Design a protein around this nucleic acid. Structure first.
Lengths: 172, 241, 99
RNA sequence: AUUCCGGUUGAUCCUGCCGGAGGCCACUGCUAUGGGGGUCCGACUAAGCCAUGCGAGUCAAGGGGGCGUCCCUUCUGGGACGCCACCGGCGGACGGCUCAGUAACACGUCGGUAACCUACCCUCGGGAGGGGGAUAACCCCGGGAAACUGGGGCUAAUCCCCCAUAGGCCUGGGGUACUGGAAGGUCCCCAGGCCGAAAGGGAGCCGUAAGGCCCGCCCGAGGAUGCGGCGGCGGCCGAUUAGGUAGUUGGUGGGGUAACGGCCCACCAAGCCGAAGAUCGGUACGGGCCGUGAGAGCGGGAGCCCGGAGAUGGACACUGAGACACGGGUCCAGGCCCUACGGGGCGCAGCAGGCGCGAAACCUCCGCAAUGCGGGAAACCGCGACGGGGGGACCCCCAGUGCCGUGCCUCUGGCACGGCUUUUCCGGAGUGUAAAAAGCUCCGGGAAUAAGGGCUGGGCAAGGCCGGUGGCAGCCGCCGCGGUAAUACCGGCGGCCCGAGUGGUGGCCACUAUUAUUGGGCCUAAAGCGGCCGUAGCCGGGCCCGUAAGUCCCUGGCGAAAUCCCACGGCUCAACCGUGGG
């Protein structure tokens, strides 16, 4: 499982959080947010444990975890286990497919890519990713182009016009 | 169970053959022979997996029968056969020679050594005992045996190096282990290491017997006399993880 | 469509080259085995009835296919040795042997 | 990743129960699970029984033939395949299934059989000389509806045997040499006794035949593999079970076993066992792990792997290294079926499928192709073991159910209307089949096109109104709510949650310091024995000294794989699996 459902699940305070982010990162289900929360939670659990124990646990393992965070971009350059603990569940919503294709500005908004990705027109690496919950490396940012294209194989298609209106980039 | 298991399962196949263990449900069980089933490397794995020369067990069985491997100087033909540890496996058809060695990981690796060394097989003998005509005979854990002496004290108690000429099944160039000799460690949890014996002194009574060694780096290890295996003054080279 | 050779093995005992293919299809359907017959004989560089086609799977939407083929010297050897799927996909023989 | 809320009252604080909120696992309602990936399915029932198909064979290159056919040739004549029965050899003890019983040296880990065996197989050494002999096939022939059965003439083989060459085993006496931690196993000589080895190969290749590649046999030794055996420690509940035991504890001799042994036996003794819980009743395959929990702890033994146990209930032997034998036999008990009523045959708690049961669980499918294995030089044969699809609210994971302009409303959005791209869906292409399927995916045509269910008084304040009705009908997990302006009923409308699920019931774990070790108490809330005595047990002032048992440190043997974390990689992606590290 990658579903996290907290001890009190219809509390006021959780519910407010959830409602507000739905075109701020793109939701169409709560689960999608729950995956990201579970990835971060496990990472912070492991980071906490290693720091707790003496130096007699083998440092190789702490080196391998820290490495992965450099690539993913949560600890961009940081190299500190305490630094993992401080992480928000808002730094992993920003590394979503839908908010990193819109960052570059190939997707008009995060909302736009909910039929680009289905219909297979946004490629990363050598392959069409189909998943909003896919998490993108710093490496992976250097190759975001298109494939198997029909509205980008026809500029003359009005699809091309709706997506790019003076070129809407960044994140919102 | 009331009978030898003729089938081995894939989930019963270890990680020491470095095999995918969810592949089917049945793993190749050698017929009883030199060596243990889980401490062996199958002939199926060596042709099929290791080299890509088969993509079905029919390919590999046909390939072995026509001939692509001789183990210890003699012919084989089916893929069922437990290949031992410290053996000599041969590709005559490629001219490769391998040693069957442990890693620090404790998986069986074939470690390449030159065509020259294929001739040699180092024996450190398993026990030494009298047979009729008042001659003592040599033994091994791969069953590899020789007969005929005059009895007596002979070269050692049981910690030997022999040079073995493998097509002839002959023994040559006998040599003791000393307190300045080489051992490679091939059982225990200290495996893959090759060094110089500091001293062979031990705990003099009961079942435990320690032997101790140092290396090139010079780390201090302790292992059983049974898990000390005398290479010689070095014959095969070290195994790498 | 474009066939390129990635990886080449030389198996001496049976006298064959065992070979890996990456085959492309960009904006085009999944590669068509009937043109691939016509294309093969030149790539492998062996006669047309002893240049053998086997294994292809085709990626979902990513336009690259991974695959394997055989180039044989010996017409005698190949039907006997090989596992049945190849022999039908190339067209040589079927399915060997029932109950 | 460590959270609390309603409810004892007029209000208050403490104590304490109940209910609810979380995870997990069955089952049940609606709907759905499109599409795709991995797990899974009489798994808490009757360890009930079965129609029908099926799980066990295989060598003619051991072997002389019978039949069909081939190459021939069309003769003499030798070379092949299928089919067929007899001895050989090997599998059939395995593989597959289930877990009733069993609380124990069942199982796990470490030990350990120098008390014991181990064929096929694998290694090294050596041997296979000579003589003797059969029965199916073939030929002929009787009966039974059957099952099944036959009597005889001939006859092959790695056919079945004897003898010798020896070896094996026992036993008495001498002595050395190998191995050991020791005890002492292995050496050799000698005497007397027994048993008294072996077998070969067709068309090819190697050797002269044997022999060998190949297949198998014999003896000596070893290895591997399987079986049995012993010990340390760990090994459930009820004390409304407290004393138990007569091969029973031991000694001595002996039998029998592969072998130790009160295993069995004779004799001799009266011991053995118990409150650190014996014995008895009761329940339960155990383990790796798993579920839950921040931990401590609690709970569990299911797919799957490991070891043991079983195969209608019970008893019994033979062949084999190995069975007292899961689709073998003998027999008894129960039950079924065929029947000239004389007499036969069985065992799905094996697999499809059936039927009974109940709250609950599948196609009389497809293949031998891949995986494993037995036999075979190989070719290849056998395989409902197995690989897969089918079906299945069984679990998990991934993904789509749109997007833009947009007048105007509830603008983290919605609807009208316009435009665009476009999952299914059609036609085509690969896949794959190892011949289907699973049809997806890709390309061309091409649609905004599968979304539901629960709740709305307080707990969840997350979500509010109308009409009917008026303590009714009903609602309810708890507290409650209805005796006529009802947010609570019922219908309708709206909104909120979650999403191929939602919700209900049952159970388990957290919440529960309501089991207190972490982390609880006993004036009055539940809880001090009416008081003492002293036993078992628990606990001990100061100073020294010996031991280093407890206690701390270090090294080394080891605690199977899988499950778990971290890392990277592959499958669009991920679940998952590989690999390395922990």
């Amino acid at each position: 499982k990658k579903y996290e459902t907290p001890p009190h699940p219809w509390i006021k305070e959780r519910l407010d959080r959830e409602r507000v982010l739905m075109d701020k990162y793109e939701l169409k289900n709560k689960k999608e947010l729950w995956k990201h929360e579970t990835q971060l939670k496990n990472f912070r659990r492991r980071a906490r444990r290693l720091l707790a124990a003496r130096g007699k646990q083998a440092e190789i393992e702490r080196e391998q975890l820290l490495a992965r965070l450099k690539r993913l971009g949560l600890l961009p350059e940081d190299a500190v286990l305490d630094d993992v603990l401080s992480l928000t569940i808002e730094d992993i919503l920003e590394r979503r497919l839908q908010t990193i294709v819109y960052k570059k500005g190939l997707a008009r908004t995060m909302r736009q890519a909910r039929q680009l990705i289905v219909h297979g027109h946004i490629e990363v690496n050598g392959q069409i990713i189909r998943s909003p919950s896919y998490l993108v490396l710093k490496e992976e940012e250097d190759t975001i182009t298109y494939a198997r294209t029909s509205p980008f194989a026809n500029p003359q298609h009005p699809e091309r016009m709706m997506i790019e209106k003076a070129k809407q980039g960044g994140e919102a | 169970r009331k009978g030898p298991k003729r089938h081995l399962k894939r989930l019963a196949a270890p990680t020491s053959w470095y095999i995918e263990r969810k592949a089917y449900k049945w793993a190749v069980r050698p017929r009883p022979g030199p060596h243990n089933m889980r401490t062996s490397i199958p002939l199926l794995y060596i042709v099929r997996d290791y080299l890509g020369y088969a993509k079905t067990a029919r390919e590999a069985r046909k390939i072995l029968n026509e001939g692509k491997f001789l183990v210890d100087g003699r012919v084989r033909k089916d893929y069922k056969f437990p290949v031992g540890i410290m053996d000599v496996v041969s590709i005559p058809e490629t001219g490769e020679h391998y040693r069957v060695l442990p890693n620090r990981i404790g998986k069986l690796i074939l470690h390449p050594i030159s065509e020259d060394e294929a001739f040699i097989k180092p024996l450190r003998i398993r026990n030494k005992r009298m047979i009729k005509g008042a001659r003592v005979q040599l033994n091994f854990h791969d069953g590899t045996n020789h007969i005929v002496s005059i009895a007596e004290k002979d070269n050692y108690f049981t910690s030997y190096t022999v040079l073995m000429k493998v097509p002839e099944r002959e023994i040559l160039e006998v040599l003791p282990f000393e307190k300045g000799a080489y051992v490679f460690v091939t059982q225990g949890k200290n495996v893959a290491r090759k060094g110089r014996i500091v001293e062979i002194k031990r705990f003099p009574m009961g079942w435990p017997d320690v032997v101790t060694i140092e290396d090139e780096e010079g780390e201090l290890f302790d292992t059983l006399k049974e898990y000390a295996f005398v290479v010689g003054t070095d014959k095969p080279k070290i195994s790498l993880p | 469509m474009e066939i390129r050779i990635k990886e080449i093995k030389e198996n001496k005992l049976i006298g064959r080259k065992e070979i890996y293919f990456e085959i492309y299809h960009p904006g085009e359907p999944t590669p068509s085995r009937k043109d691939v017959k016509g294309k093969l004989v030149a790539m492998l560089d062996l006669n047309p009835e002893t240049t053998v086609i086997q294994y292809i799977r085709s990626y979902f939407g990513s336009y690259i296919s991974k695959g394997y083929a055989k180039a044989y010297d010996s017409k005698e050897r190949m039907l006997y040795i090989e596992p049945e799927y190849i022999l039908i996909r190339d067209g040589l023989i079927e399915k060997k042997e029932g109950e």
